[PDB]
């Protein structure tokens, strides 16, 4: 599993093992990659893609954080002009002055804690690391890396993009967060582990009546004897005058 355990908490270890039983991380990554490939095949000719490719992926790749590999390979009939790296929410992107024929897509799943639940920073850092890494081999220098935070249900991509891929990837991520089977199973297991389920007309009479009962208010008189300077002259106001 790709989860790091800061501090020997056997309780949390058992709980996380129960949640991710039966190689759930690998199944989640597999489901995500198949869903993305299906989406790309359903919109193949619209973006000038010759075909998609299922890269041979080592099982550990799903939970391999030190290095990485390729997940999906896109082959083209025409040249793809590529743009400079931008985030998933970067509406304005600057075009790079180069083209390619084979385009790689990588999927990285993470379990972010409270301090490191920023998916965009993680995606950017890991894209700039794996691309310029020596134990990670990419088919092409140009591609996209999508980081998905299962602990907080986030997703962001920072790699190199070509025109027409932005909306496709956006709705692909939307639909895959909305209706992935493996992600739904993860959510259900987490829920089970957490045991959480879903005038001067009538006012004059009132004033007269209140003043009629104001006699009893004189029987209880309180003096706010606090914050007294105790230097000036004291007040000896009599009780009869105050009652009157």
């Amino acid at each position: 599993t790709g989860i790091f355990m800061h501090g020997k908490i056997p309780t949390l270890k058992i709980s996380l093992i129960q949640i991710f039983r039966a190689h759930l991380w690998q199944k989640i990554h597999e489901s995500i990659v198949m869903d993305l490939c299906q989406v790309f095949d359903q919109e193949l000719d619209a973006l000038e893609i010759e075909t998609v490719q299922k890269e041979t992926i080592h099982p550990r790749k799903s939970y391999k954080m030190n290095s990485s590999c390729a997940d999906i390979l896109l082959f083209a009939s025409y040249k793809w002009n590529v743009s400079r790296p931008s985030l998933l929410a970067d509406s304005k992107d600057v075009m790079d002055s180069t083209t390619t024929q084979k385009y790689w897509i990588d999927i990285q799943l993470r379990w972010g804690d409270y301090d490191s639940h920023d998916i965009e920073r993680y995606a950017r850092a890991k894209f700039l690391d794996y691309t310029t890494d020596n134990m990670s081999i990419y088919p092409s220098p140009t591609g996209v890396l999508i980081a998905i935070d299962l602990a907080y249900n986030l997703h962001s991509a920072y790699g190199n993009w070509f025109p027409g891929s932005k909306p496709l990837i956006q709705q692909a991520m939307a639909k895959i967060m909305k209706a992935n089977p493996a992600l739904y199973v993860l959510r259900e297991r987490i829920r089970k582990g957490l045991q959480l389920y879903s005038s001067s007309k009538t006012e004059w009479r009132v004033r007269a009546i209140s003043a009629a009962n104001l006699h009893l208010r004189t029987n209880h008189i309180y003096v706010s004897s606090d914050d007294i300077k105790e230097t000036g002259y004291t007040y000896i106001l009599p009780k009869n005058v105050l009652k009157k």
């Binding site: 301090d115 986030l154 962001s156 956006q170 309180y222």
Partner: protein
Amino acid sequence: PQSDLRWSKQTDVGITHFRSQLIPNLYRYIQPWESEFIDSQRVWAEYALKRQEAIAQNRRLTLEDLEDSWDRGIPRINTLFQKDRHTLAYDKGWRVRTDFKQYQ
């Protein structure tokens, strides 16, 4: 710490970050005994006059006419509205009984 007051929320437009101090102390929310006692005296004098004027009008004091005095008074203007009121009028010696409950 402020570092623990930041949180993120994701919409289709993207992820947005937000921020929000000292933990409140109990003593700030418990009324002092002296204030409790002066408040009790004034509130029960008010209740006495309200009860006598309600009797003068031949009516029973409601919850609304005493809601201004809610949660004020050492007894409880609130208790004046409890159902067992009649039953609890015979439960004499209850403070000493509660103190002696430690032996049982």
